[model samples]
Target chain A: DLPEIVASGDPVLHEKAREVDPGEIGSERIQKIIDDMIKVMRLAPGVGLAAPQIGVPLRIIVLEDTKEYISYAPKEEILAQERRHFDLMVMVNPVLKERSNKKALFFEGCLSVDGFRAAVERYLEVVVTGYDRQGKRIEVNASGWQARILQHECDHLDGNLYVDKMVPRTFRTVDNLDLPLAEGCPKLGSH
Target chain B: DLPEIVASGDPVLHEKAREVDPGEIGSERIQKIIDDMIKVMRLAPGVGLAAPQIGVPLRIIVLEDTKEYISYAPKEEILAQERRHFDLMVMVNPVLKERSNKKALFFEGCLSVDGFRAAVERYLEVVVTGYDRQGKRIEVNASGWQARILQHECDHLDGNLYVDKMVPRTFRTVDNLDLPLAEGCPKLGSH
Candidate 1:
């Protein structure tokens, strides 16, 4: 059964999850968590999900991007923002470093936080050095939208949320977004 | 010798610069532009520079950030924005793609559009795909302050400017930027 995503303000949601034992990386329990996280992420229609978000206190992350789920935005905007296709990924004991000198700004929300999205400024490109689900070391150079996903999921593992980095003026309920954040410029070359 | 940085309102700065030929990526003429653009950029004491700003009708860019150059702001504020260090880079036939859905807002200034800076929100991460001055295909995923630089420079290549993406209320001259825009963490943040 998929775990219920803990809401923000839950004690576990604010707590930092721990690194997995290298041996534990290959355990059946971990695999199940990864599997269920994927199921739950899709159920919740989220780009990524972290273990802490599922009430587990472990440094694990599961992420993906389904362009089909992006009905909330338009074609040109989807192209302009360059949101990428992220194959399903499971990271264990993930640590983020080699942050780019540059940063990006965009609205982000969480399944756990629920109901609100805020503009967060994040590094456009980041080096996420971590273990794959198999306990193998993997260094991921993530940028554009994937980088943002990595940051959001990892932040959950560290007891932080996008709210901490938010642009106050830009925070709004999904029900309240009024401004057109994207536009069509056929002459401007697609996306 | 450095070409004069065409001031804002100059029709040349408003018109799109042409893309360099594939072979011109490493040409001496291109190299000269890169060399002197660096000189002019540093003379402007700005973090980034673009070819169009200096009257060149070519899609090339040069940018770097040395924290020491920002004496007007506090050290903590600089770190709060998560600004990263960037080595000077020159890009030719540069095309910016893969924009992040998440956005970041910060005060941005331009050397060409002198004496005014605005709170321009930009994609937190972006992919810059093109050839380097050495003609190597380089893809840069940049975010944070560096991401801001990429958006600004790339906009120049397309004949756009930061003002176009700016929060009109937050536009101010260097002398007039107020405390709330700087800190009060007030109603401004609620956006």
Candidate 2:
């Protein structure tokens, strides 16, 4: 088992994470952290996890949206959210490069900020550059829900919480999240 | 004259700014910085300016949108953008507290990131708490374009540019910004 996922109040979650040194990329400690991140992410049943969420201050993140997770939401909602299945992937020191002008609003939850969800506006497409878990360079050209996941995970590296960027009036607990969108807020999906 | 507004690539623009100590709030140096910020903001003809933008990485900001500036945009655009006249105000170490769920999209130009504009989504209303230039506590309950200015200027303290949160594909040089919105991009104002 991996270390427990950090909660919102943890100082680690509020500070910028350090970049992994080139020489240490493939070391046992780095590899173990990546392994733990994946295990914790899957066990938490979250589509994404960041190193800082596990009390590690490295610039690392893991994400995946499996077919299982995709089945939880209605097909119509999924279509509008642009959700789709994607295999697990790890990114180290990821940097957001380019993004689409398009935008969408939807509810999002985080393991770190448990029991809460809020509508957030995110780009429909984004291009991210970084190294893979194995230290090979990779680029993530993502759209729809995947792009949102990338944005959310990367934000952790910079000491930002979705709550900081959430459409504030729409914030609600999961049990209370089924209510209608707040007046004057955008609709729940791509405009 | 105040130091030229630091550009996008300045290291100072990319890192979190230091907070102004309580004891320093009313000192001559702090007052001078505030004075310089206002003068630079007006000289730059910008609606707002941040301490970091003027090479002083303190959590201070000044903003105003005069009737003169309001005349530059079409009446419909002004109304849709929620632009309104507000006198000069200084905020020291402001913290955003409450924000409206309502979001509006409009083009924003920054003095630091000159020669370009992009559509950024901003909350229509916001509540910010901080100290005035004199060290007295103040709470700013702002709405409309004033709210937008508050968000933009506060973002600087956290090392975020409007471009970081701007709708990516909508970025354009001032000369090219008058064209039609990119495909799938939201309209020019609040929906």
Candidate 3:
């Protein structure tokens, strides 16, 4: 069975995570972590996962957005979120290298902060550079929902979470995600 | 009498604010808004106030950290917060121009989100560029507590609350601010 995801308030989720040693990228320890991250991410049915999320402090992240998940959202939201299917990817020591001035706001959920969703603004375009599971240099230039996923996973490496960057007024449990926004609250979309 | 400060959940606190036209920077309408922000912020005994916090959607902010407020905290806290007294400042159409990589985490309270405090990470150094109440170009390079105040108020103009950037696990009411953190939570300090 897969290990349970770490919950919020755990010290592991709050401190700066350690960087993966370059020499150990292909070691059995690293290989095991990568495999587990993939399984847990898929099982959780989430788009991404980070090492700190599983009580590991190494700077590693895995992500994939499958078409099956896209079938759930309305067509309108699909376009707004700029989501598309992608194969699983494992990044070690990933760094957010650049970002566009444009930003988009949307409600986000976390496996760690279960049941809660809140509006968060993320850069619409971003460039991430890192080493792959095989220690090969790789760069991902992403936009839309993909960019958001990268930013969120990268943040875990630094002990940050979506809750730390959500629009406080828009925080709500999943059950009330559609409740009318308080007076003057901006609608969720590109800004 | 000053207008009552708008509280959290109000629509004004959730949307991006409008920019103050350069020509209107020193007009009576703009001056009145600035005066009101300052008055309400002082009346609430808060260190800063944003136009959105007063139901105004202009990109204007007012701030002042007085020795009187600092006197309430213990010496250690004062030093930790880098608290100090400063005369009031009014910024119109302010833009966050630069920020340092260094960051600090501390519990922050917003007048709009009354009675709640949460730990939020903030850039320790920042440069804000804008026009003063007199329509003169002004740039303030600030650090420590001053930088925190700037980031908070600026966020308001963008329809964001400190809660949005707060460490989710550290959120609590003022009465519970001293309670022990959830297991594994990071302590408040520089990172």
Candidate 4:
């Protein structure tokens, strides 16, 4: 069954997630949450997603290649091009290893928190120490948008939304409703 | 003196990048390119950067986090808050492997091709297969913003840009004149 997609103001959204017990890892319930989280992330058009976004209070998070699925098509050539877009990943009990003395401010939004955005400061690159779905210890050094999304979703796991770090007076609400919600609005707005 | 940031219509922007020769792997010149690239990326307030952006025309890239340089102080109360922000990384002859079958789209802007933003499709998670700065082959799986930016910069080495895979009719132009020249318009004017 498709698990419920958590919405704004859900208690689970504000609570820090508990670590997934190894015994419960990959169980039917956990798998269901993972699948549903992916579906919700797709529907939200976000590059990365966290369990809290779907109202699950577990520290589990799922990341998938949103680009490949968006570019998928019937034509072989297009599909070939689309293949580059599919790169999904799941992480649990992640940790940050190192941060550089550099910063970039990019406009960001969220699902549980909607309709507003701001130029939030984030590390342009980061090294994450964490475990993957199989409970294997993994250390990843990341930069660019991938790093940004990791920080954003990881914030959710700690009850921090992108809005928390937004620059004062920089927050702006989006005007164009026609843009696909997945594309996200320009002037930062969050629910 | 810093080289001028490459912009759209600059011949260097469209030219294909050369693969770094294995023999040139540890040369000081390569190290200098890495340094220059990092500087340019920091100036551009970008998370991930490529050699082509700086006219190196080589298959090399750098990723770093810039959060520490920004004024926002980290919330100390949050437990185990890993700083997945500003850090530095270098990659040569990179390849993305074991991608997921999900898709998400987000607004993306590039430093080389400035003044325009697009809703580019990208995978939320991916395993980056490539050689590290020391020329050791490494495979790192990543998700979230880190994965997004890594793929975004890696695409540059192959003569690809985020604009190449943007959703049709989803490009936006930045209007603020005082903002960084390379910082293109936020995704506006599109639905």
Comparing 2 and 3 on lDDT, the stronger one:
3
Against the true structure, whose lDDT is highest? 3
Q: What is the C-alpha lDDT of each candidate?
A: 0.72, 0.81, 0.83, 0.62
Superior candidate under TM-score, 2 versus 4? 2
Evaluating just chain A, the predictions reach TM-scores of 0.88, 0.97, 0.96, 0.75
lDDT of 2 by residue, A1-191 (tens): 34998665455665689999865778888999999999999997999999998989989999999999998888998999989999999999999854768889988878876655678889999999989988889988999999999999998887776866776345555765676653445677787
> Which of the numbered candidates is closest to the native, going by highest TM-score?
3
Off by over 4 Å in 3: B1-191
Compose the digit string of candidate 3's lDDT tens values, residues A35-134.
9999999997899999998989999999998899887988999999888888888999999954769989998877877656778889999998989999
The residue ranges of model 1 lying beyond 4 angstroms of the native Cα positions read A1-191, B70-72, B179-191
| Candidate 2 wrong stretches, greater than 4 Å | B1-191
Encode model 2's per-residue lDDT on B112-138: one tens digit a residue.
Answer: 655556789999889999999899999
* Candidate 4 global lDDT: 0.62
Give the per-residue lDDT digits (tens) of candidate 1, residues B65-120.
Answer: 87576546767766656677777888888888747577766777777655455677
- DockQ of all candidate complexes: 0.01, 0.02, 0.12, 0.01
